[PDB]
Design a binder for this molecule. Structure first.
Ligand code: CLA
Ligand code: CLA
Ligand code: CLA
Ligand code: CLA
Ligand code: CLA
Ligand code: CLA
Ligand SMILES: CCCCCCCCCCCCCCCCCC(=O)OC[C@H](CO[C@@H]1O[C@H](CO)[C@H](O)[C@H](O)[C@H]1O)OC(=O)CCCCCCCCCCCCCCCCC
Ligand SMILES: CC1=C(C#C/C(C)=C/C=C/C(C)=C/C=C/C=C(C)/C=C/C=C(C)/C=C/[C@@]23O[C@]2(C)C[C@@H](O)CC3(C)C)C(C)(C)C[C@H](O)C1
Ligand SMILES: CC1=C(/C=C/C(C)=C/C=C/C(C)=C/C=C/C=C(C)/C=C/C=C(C)/C=C/C2=C(C)CCCC2(C)C)C(C)(C)CCC1
Ligand SMILES: CC1=C(C/C=C(\C)CCC[C@H](C)CCC[C@H](C)CCCC(C)C)C(=O)c2ccccc2C1=O
Ligand SMILES: CC1=C(C/C=C(\C)CCC[C@H](C)CCC[C@H](C)CCCC(C)C)C(=O)c2ccccc2C1=O
Ligand code: SF4
Ligand code: SF4
Ligand code: SF4
Lengths: 329, 79, 130, 86, 659
């Protein structure tokens, strides 16, 4: 994900510094159709989850999208290995097992496609509209990394390719978090675990195969994956092995929240606060000749993005690693 | 009910339901008549608020305007 | 006494049921009469579909089904390539015997921190080269 | 439309005029300063509100001020391209 | 004006009730009359809300059955008529053959029961009477519009002979803008006499209803016991009546202070303010009056939030586990909103109402404050930094030591000052008893000390942001000429280093996040200490206890409400828990991604629409041409999403945990 957003960034830089290719001359249809496909994908894919949530809450499981109810079979997801029936085991563990795809896999894969397409939309818009646009016609003169062009024309905030990356990084992080959660839950529920005894084995999975039944709802994701599987990391303080992981969980939550400061606030408030503070220093004759300044707009965005991504990644890192370490030992 | 609360299940708290509805159709109809009066008055008030004051009224409206003696006394007293 | 007569008598704090124990006894009777433990949702929605060995029941991938998924719906997974395990054990035992004969002496556990002289070194051994 | 005003602190360096994206400003003769010229804003109807003049103003506080008026937005001040209000 | 964009709706809706900004609202007479009419309509809305609550209690609910066995019974709010619910089988909210019902968490049942309601007929009569009161309010609005119109007509028709007739221009709104008479009558009749009237109501209706044996009303109904009657677990009704009698007498006395109807009696507020420490201010300023009223209302709302929980005034209210928490949280949130409102309207007063003197002149309180606003802000910043540094550092020390498994290594500062104050209060109460008070005194420990310092941090930072906005509203070192610009404007451009969030409205936007945080801290403290007093006392000294024993542990019933196993009566709470999470996350979008990207995206979408074959020939795009939300519009919308999600995701949690 990080290197893909990087490729988008440096594509934008190349467009700014050099002449672009001729596919930029019909950029409006390209980005328009990408916008439409993003909207349609998000609507359908996420609204299936929302429909499942609402109907299940109302008490109508027969109306939801699931294997027992209306089912969205992934017809195109076909085997190619041609493996023999069964699973491969090694000393009380399942080294290899076929992943069986159903409505949950259909829904999660289309969520993946939606998020990938939205990230691609942000990156491609930044690349194609880097030199100029209907809003501002001298974006090339403005450069690559500028905060805006002004409050004019309604407001030209984050029109630069740098800001387009600044948003595409958020979207890449969202996509990768969903991918990580999908992989983690699916592997725990349907692949990993132990077995209990031509011989037939009953496979006891770590998550107990709850992905196919609970993953069909956002509430199921919230309960069976985050809340239920955060027991290890949340209750890791006394345990010698993973107390560090619990503390890092807490600290990553703190850092992620602290990023919202920079992501929501603006330069002028902090500059005025700094001046008011500096009044007292000048009063007491503490005169810093490297005059304090509030972080620039682009720097504030960068700091917020860095802290946001780092905190989220740290929370996920600690959560998954604590769960795995405890379960395997 | 299918209670979902730990305390509800523990203490056996219940939501008793009457055998007969509290109010009858006639009572609901009377309340709706009062509500309709409120609605008509409220629509009139919304129209008045939308149109604000009309200083042109002294040109055509009947009468010569009037200030209550108490209002005159308040004006004389001042603020 | 019993729930029927408890509810027939009813509870009223204002008049007779001035006893919190009686009040909550009536409450428990009403609870048992009018409340249900669960909504009664069909148990099928709780059973797993994928990874439980019962995938074929749902017929999700009927057109050109994946052979690796067991056809049995009992929920048990056979071990893939069972026949090879005895063969693999025989091969590894045969190789062990072959190398044992080739060396001519019992295998000695290697030392993680130990140092061993090369078998072709020209100097007198300090630590056995094996 | 926005309101672009010029104050006598102006020194007539022309940087605002050169930074104007839609040519709202022009230098006019004056005697207030040594440069003998002061920026004017005759075509304020074309002002978009980018405050590039304000960015380029050297004076300690700006001798040119752009007051944004979101209630009186016009197509010229909004830079409308796909839609036409004329 | 035909030439318009889709931003027209948002621009209008952001100032629909900003009457001062209305076009063709020529004068203060129009402003005051419009505000008075709006007030009347607001009173009508309140009365209709009361009537609706009473009607639904009477009709859809079980008040008569509840009052028989209040302790185990649960009040019904209203029925559920929602077609989307399952029809094949009964819902969790029904008795398997009965209309679905919702439990009521507003305490209105206890309110009515201790007020003296015994039958649903009385509730029906009240519903009817409050609807009639709403009619009366609207008709009074109409009456006053007509009376003021008749005075303008008179002034037009009649003129004083001398040229000073224009002086009457100032006195046309005397009835609405007079302060002395309004103060006298409000404090004497609207407060003191209202209290005396409610004492009469208590003595006549509430006391006989509560007391089983009949007894004639007399001074025996006025008592000065204290504490809670054991049977109802609430304050003695006889004491409430004396309370209100005493306050009513005091305020009736105070209501003769100013000269209201004659100049022979009473004193003038201008004269008091002129002769007092505060030199004088624009008492006529409607924004200033609103700010003062909002500050008073905020403090009173906080006081009621604390005292309804501490000293239970309503029958069996304490027994209701959920209603107590809901009431406390509700009124705490209302109080926080009113406080930040007072600050915002003080800022607006400074922006567009205060008449600043010349710079060197320092005669008024506002000018004196503006002289050393820099010192005020620097000291407030110092206090905030100290509180944050040390609270967070002590919490992190405890966190690390607990994670390593050594509670003995935690820093645990005993709350000696609070314990001394509590012991003095307990000594006074014990002396009075020798001559019970539940929840007025609580164990108080180092965890309480840390949480109190955290709440102090929140309050100090919120006040820091609001004071900075107010005192920099007129001017600032970064933007000296901020008086000319409106209260809320987008920015000042990327020049001068960048000027995001430079307006006083932007300071309010920022202080709103803090208010929500400090209120969340307060609510978490109350809820945790309420749910688990012992666990809170022992473990609340490190933040992992808050994150694990409070949130993660108590989140189980809510998330388990509806699942593959089934649903229960908390399924609605679980769906609103997730809906509000989604609303919060949506607010993040408007808060993070700003307008240029979205304007370019809107341009592309508009291009697609104009290139579509059928749609182009019908829709030109000229009228209401779509546009991206302005900078301030998006700031406000993101703030609204954030606030809605944050506020509305809590009640589901508290109901789930306390039910
Ligand atoms: C949960 C939080 C959230 C949500 C809901 C969205 C939603 C969206 N973002 Mg994202 N975004 C977020 C957070 C979120 N964002 C944050 C925090 C940031 C800052 C980094 C961004 C930054 C950002 C950018 C920069 C861009 C997006 C884009 C989009 C859109 C994607 C395409 C689409 O609409 O398909 C899916 C839409 C949804 C899932 C919305 C909910 C639909 C529900 C399920 C159905 C509605 C049912 C019914 C009709 C409701 C009626 C209600 C009424 C009766 C009251 C969509 C509006 C892209 C876009 O606009 O592309 C076209 C885009 O360029 N976002
Ligand atoms: C598809 C999903 C869906 C839909 C469409 C509805 C629809 C409804 N539910 Mg809900 N409900 C749902 C899912 C859904 N539910 C789920 C999953 C659950 C959990 C199992 C519930 C649980 C539930 C309960 C327990 C209850 C309802 C009720 C209702 C009804 C509300 C009527 C009302 O007073 O509206 C009025 C709506 C409002 C006051 C909110 C308006 C908010 C928006 C933002 C507008 C704000 C105003 C603004 C100024 C704009 C005005 C514009 C206008 C003038 C054009 C309505 C039929 C209630 C009912 O039966 O009422 C009779 C009720 O008690 N529902
Ligand atoms: C958004 C605003 C808001 C909301 C929604 C609520 C909601 C609530 N408040 Mg309120 N409250 C608010 C703001 C708000 N409050 C503020 C700002 C304050 C501080 C002043 C208070 C102070 C406060 C107190 C002190 C109490 C509440 C209580 C309540 C509950 C309402 C009970 C009720 O209606 O009984 C139904 C009403 C009646 C049976 C009778 C009402 C009698 C009044 C006087 C009617 C109006 C008189 C009429 C105009 C007179 C006609 C004219 C004639 C005399 C000449 C509920 C939780 C009560 C509570 O917690 O109960 C458990 C409670 O004790 N609130
Ligand atoms: C808060 C303090 C305060 C102060 C500094 C003043 C100062 C003044 N008042 Mg007074 N005034 C006050 C409170 C105060 N007032 C209150 C609370 C009321 C309402 C009752 C009034 C009502 C009032 C009126 C109507 C008038 C004044 C006037 C005056 C002036 C003459 C005072 C005088 O002769 O007193 C000496 C007289 C006395 C000490 C006798 C007072 C006896 C009556 C009954 C009041 C006492 C009430 C008591 C304090 C509360 C009882 C509570 C209950 C539980 C028993 C002076 C500027 C007069 C003036 O010149 O105005 C321009 C005038 O007309 N005042
Ligand atoms: C068109 C829209 C609109 C609407 C719907 C309202 C609605 C309201 N305005 Mg109005 N207002 C408007 C526009 C509007 N306003 C405009 C454009 C202005 C010009 C700035 C004002 C200026 C204004 C002022 C100056 C005031 C109002 C108030 C009110 C209330 C009217 C009466 C009422 O029912 O109070 C119901 C309120 C209660 C039942 C609570 C009563 C308790 C009060 C609020 C607190 C008293 C504290 C006291 C001073 C000190 C206590 C000290 C103690 C702690 C020791 C209501 C909330 C009054 C209000 O209450 O403001 C908060 C008020 O004072 N408005
Ligand atoms: C967890 C998230 C977080 C954190 C840690 C902080 C930290 C801070 N904010 Mg806050 N803030 C946040 C979120 C957060 N904010 C959000 C989401 C917003 C909305 C945009 C704001 C908006 C905001 C404003 C507008 C202001 C603050 C201020 C402050 C300071 C308060 C005093 C203090 O605690 O000093 C101690 C320092 C810390 C606890 C930081 C940790 C330091 C090391 C690791 C120990 C501090 C730097 C005020 C300020 O600058 O006061 C001087 C101020 O004016 N914040
Ligand atoms: C439900 C419980 C939990 C949630 C509680 C509610 C959420 C918290 C409240 C939000 C926090 C801020 C509150 C302050 C409000 C005033 C702010 C303000 O006016 O500035 C908002 C500002 C005002 O607008 C600005 O004004 C400036 C002058 O000061 C300049 O002219 C600027 O150019 C102009 O943009 O910005 C907007 O214009 C915002 C756009 C508003 C769009 C809303 C349209 C859609 C409305 C649908 C909902 C129905 C509304 C009625 C509600 C019914 C309730 C009975
Ligand atoms: C016109 C005319 C003339 C005439 C005439 C004559 C004789 C006219 C006679 C008219 C006549 C006889 C008109 C009766 C009306 C009865 C009404 C409206 C009753 C409503 C009753 C209502 C709305 C009650 C409603 C409810 O409360 C009820 C009852 C039960 C409650 O649960 C609640 C509800 C709300 C349901 C002159 C004088 C001869 C000459 C002149 O030149 C012209
Ligand atoms: C019963 C009956 C009847 C009738 C019926 C009906 C027809 C009803 C209706 C009903 C309805 C249909 C109702 C409704 C209501 C409503 C309401 C009551 C509301 C109100 C409102 C208010 C109060 C407010 C307002 C406002 C607003 C919101 C905004 C601004 C302005 C104002 C302020 C105005 C009859 C006579 C035939 C016969 C007999 C019986
Ligand atoms: C807080 C904030 C500021 C003010 C923040 C500043 C000036 C940063 C302070 C820099 C310090 C001095 C760097 C030194 C590093 C830290 C002090 C290290 C702390 C480490 C702890 C573990 C102790 C902005 O200037 C800003 C600008 C634009 C958008 C958002 C914001 C924004 O959110
Ligand atoms: C999503 C988004 C947009 C785009 C969103 C827009 C233009 C609003 C989207 C429209 C919604 C879906 C409401 C439209 C619903 C109906 C068209 C209502 C019509 C009824 C009228 C009569 C009022 C911005 O313009 C923006 C600007 C600045 C910072 C952040 C953002 C931002 O996050
Ligand atoms: S407005 Fe500024 S840049 Fe332009 S002439 Fe005046 S001082 Fe120079
Ligand atoms: S704001 Fe921009 S367009 Fe308007 S006068 Fe200044 S430089 Fe020219
Ligand atoms: S980034 Fe700052 S300066 Fe640029 S348009 Fe946005 S608010 Fe204005």
């Amino acid at each position: 994900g990080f290197f893909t957003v990087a490729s988008g960034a440096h594509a934008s830089i190349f467009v700014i510094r050099q002449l672009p290719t001729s596919e930029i001359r019909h950029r409006d249809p390209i980005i328009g159709h990408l916008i439409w496909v993003c909207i349609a994908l998000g609507l359908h894919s996420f609204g299936l989850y929302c429909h499942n949530d609402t109907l299940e809450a109302l008490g109508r499981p027969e109306d939801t999208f699931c294997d027992n109810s209306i089912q969205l079979k992934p017809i195109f997801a076909k085997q190619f290995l041609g493996l023999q029936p069964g699973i491969e085991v090694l000393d009380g563990k399942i080294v290899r097992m076929t992943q069986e795809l159903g409505t949950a896999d259909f829904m999660v894969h289309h969520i993946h496609a939606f998020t990938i397409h939205v990230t691609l939309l942000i990156l491609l818009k930044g690349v194609l509209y880097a030199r100029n646009s209907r809003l501002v016609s001298d974006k090339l003169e403005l450069g690559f990394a500028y905060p805006c062009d002004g409050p004019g024309r309604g407001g030209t905030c984050q029109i630069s390719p740098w800001d387009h990356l600044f948003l595409a990084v958020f979207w890449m992080y969202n996509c990768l978090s969903v991918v990580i959660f999908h992989y983690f839950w699916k592997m725990q529920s349907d692949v990993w675990g132990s077995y209990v005894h031509h011989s037939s084995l009953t496979c006891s999975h770590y998550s107990q195969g709850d992905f196919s039944v609970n993953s069909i709802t956002i509430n199921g994701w919230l309960r069976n994956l985050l809340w239920s599987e955060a027991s290890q990391v949340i209750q890791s303080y006394a345990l010698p092995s993973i107390c560090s992981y619990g503390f890092i969980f807490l600290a990553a939550h703190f850092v992620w929240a602290f990023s919202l400061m920079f992501l929501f606030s603006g330069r002028a408030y902090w500059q005025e606060l700094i001046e008011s503070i500096l009044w007292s220093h000048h009063k007491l004759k503490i005169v810093p000749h490297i005059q304090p300044r509030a972080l620039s707009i682009s720097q504030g965005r960068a700091v917020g993005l860095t802290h946001y991504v780092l905190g989220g990644i740290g929370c996920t890192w600690a959560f998954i690693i604590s769960r795995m370490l405890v379960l395997t030992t | 009910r299918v209670p979902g609360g730990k305390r509800t299940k523990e203490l056996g708290l219940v939501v008793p339901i009457p055998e007969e509805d509290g109010l009858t159709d006639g009572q609901i109809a009377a309340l709706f008549v009062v509500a309709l009066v409120v609605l008509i008055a409220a629509v009139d008030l919304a129209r008045s608020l939308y149109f604000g004051l009309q200083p042109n009224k002294f040109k055509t409206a009947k009468g010569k305007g009037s200030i209550t003696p108490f209002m005159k006394r308040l004006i004389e007293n001042g603020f | 006494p019993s729930d029927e007569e408890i509810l027939a008598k009813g509870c009223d704090i204002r008049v007779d049921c001035t006893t919190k124990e009686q009040q909550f006894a009536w409450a428990k009777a009403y609870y048992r009469k009018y409340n249900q433990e669960t909504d009664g949702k069909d148990p099928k929605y709780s059973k797993p579909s994928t990874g439980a060995g019962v995938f074929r029941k749902f017929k999700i991938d009927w057109p050109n089904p994946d052979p690796s998924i067991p056809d049995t719906t009992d929920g048990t997974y056979p071990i893939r390539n069972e026949d090879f395990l005895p063969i693999w054990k025989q091969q590894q035992e045969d190789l062990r015997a072959k190398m044992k004969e080739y060396i001519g002496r019992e295998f000695t556990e290697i030392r993680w921190i130990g140092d061993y002289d090369n078998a072709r070194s020209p100097y007198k051994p300090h630590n056995g080269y094996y | 439309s926005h309101a672009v005003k010029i104050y006598d602190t102006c020194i007539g360096c022309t940087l605002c005029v050169r930074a104007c994206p839609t040519d709202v400003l022009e230098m006019v003769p004056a005697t207030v300063n040594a440069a003998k010229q002061v920026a004017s804003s005759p075509r304020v109807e074309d002002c978009v509100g980018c405050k590039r003049c304000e960015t380029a103003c050297p004076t300690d506080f700006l001798s040119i001020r752009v007051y944004l008026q979101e209630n009186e937005e016009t197509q010229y001040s909004l830079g409308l391209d796909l839609a036409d209000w004329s | 004006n035909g030439r318009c964009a889709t931003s027209r709706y948002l621009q209008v809706m952001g100032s629909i009730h900003d009457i001062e900004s209305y076009f063709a609202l020529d004068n203060t007479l129009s402003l005051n009359l419009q505000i008075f009419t709006a007030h009347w309509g607001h009173l009508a809305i309140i009365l209709m809300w009361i009537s609706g609550n009473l009607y639904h209690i009477a009709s859809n609910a079980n008040y008569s059955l509840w009052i028989k066995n209040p302790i185990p019974s649960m009040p019904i709010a209203h029925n559920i008529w929602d077609p989307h619910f399952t029809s094949s089988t009964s819902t969790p909210y029904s008795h398997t053959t009965t209309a679905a019902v919702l439990i009521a968490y507003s305490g209105i049942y206890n309110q009515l029961y201790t007020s003296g309601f015994s039958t649903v007929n009385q509730i029906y009569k009240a519903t009817f009477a409050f609807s009639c009161l709403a009619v009366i309010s609207i008709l009074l609005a109409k009456i006053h519009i007509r009376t003021h119109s008749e005075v303008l007509h008179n002034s037009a028709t009649h003129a004083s002979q001398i040229p000073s007739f224009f002086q009457l221009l100032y006195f046309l709104d005397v009835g609405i803008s007079s302060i002395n008479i309004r103060l006298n009558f409000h404090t004497g009749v609207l407060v003191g006499f209202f209290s005396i009237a409610y004492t009469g109501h208590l003595l006549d209706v509430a006391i006989p209803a509560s007391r089983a044996p009949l007894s004639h009303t007399s001074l025996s109904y006025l008592t000065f016991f204290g504490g809670l009657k054991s049977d109802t677990a609430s304050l003695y009704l006889t004491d409430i009546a004396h309370h209100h009698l005493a306050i009513g007498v005091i305020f009736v006395y105070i209501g003769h202070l100013y000269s209201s109807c004659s100049t022979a009696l009473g004193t003038y507020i201008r004269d008091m303010l002129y002769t007092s420490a505060i030199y004088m201010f624009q008492i006529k300023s409607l924004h200033l009056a609103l700010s003062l009223a909002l500050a008073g209302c905020a403090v009173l709302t906080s006081a009621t939030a604390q005292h309804i929980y501490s000293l239970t005034p309503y029958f069996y209210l304490s027994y209701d586990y959920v209603t107590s928490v809901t009431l406390y949280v509700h009124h705490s949130y209302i109080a926080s909103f009113l406080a930040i409102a007072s600050h915002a309207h003080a800022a607006i007063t400074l922006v567009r109402d205060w008449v600043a003197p010349l710079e060197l002149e320092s005669s008024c309180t506002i000018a004196r404050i503006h002289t050393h606003k820099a010192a005020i802000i620097s000291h407030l910043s110092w206090v905030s930094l100290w509180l944050g540094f040390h609270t967070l550092a002590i919490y992190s020390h405890n966190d690390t030591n607990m994670a390593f498994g050594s509670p003995s290594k935690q820093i645990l500062i005993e709350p000696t000052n609070a314990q001394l104050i509590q012991e003095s209060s307990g000594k006074a109460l014990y002396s009075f008893a020798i001559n019970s008070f539940g929840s007025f005194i609580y164990p108080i420990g180092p965890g309480d000390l840390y949480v109190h310092h955290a709440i102090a941090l929140g309050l100090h930072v919120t006040v820091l942001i609001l004071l900075k906005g107010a005192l920099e509203a007129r001017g600032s070192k970064l933007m000296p000429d901020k008086m000319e610009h409106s209260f809320g404007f987008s920015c000042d451009g990327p020049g001068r280093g960048g000027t995001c969030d430079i307006s006083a409205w932007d300071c309010f936007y920022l202080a709103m996040f803090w208010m929500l945080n400090t209120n969340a801290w307060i609510d978490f403290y109350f809820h945790y200490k309420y749910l688990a007093p012992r666990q809170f006392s022992e473990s609340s000294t490190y933040l992992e206890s808050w994150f694990r024993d409070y949130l993660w542990f108590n989140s189980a019933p809510l998330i388990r409400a509806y699942s593959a196993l089934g649903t229960n009566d908390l399924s609605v709470q679980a769906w609103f828990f997730l809906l509000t999470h989604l609303a919060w996350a949506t607010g993040f979008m408007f808060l993070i991604s700003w307008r240029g990207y979205w304007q370019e995206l809107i341009d592309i979408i508009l291009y697609m629409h104009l290139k579509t074959p059928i749609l182009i020939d019908l829709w030109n795009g000229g009228v209401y041409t779509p546009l991206a939300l302005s900078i301030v519009q998006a700031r406000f919308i993101g703030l609204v999403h954030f606030t809605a999600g944050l506020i509305l995701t809590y009640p589901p949690f508290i109901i789930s945990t306390t039910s």
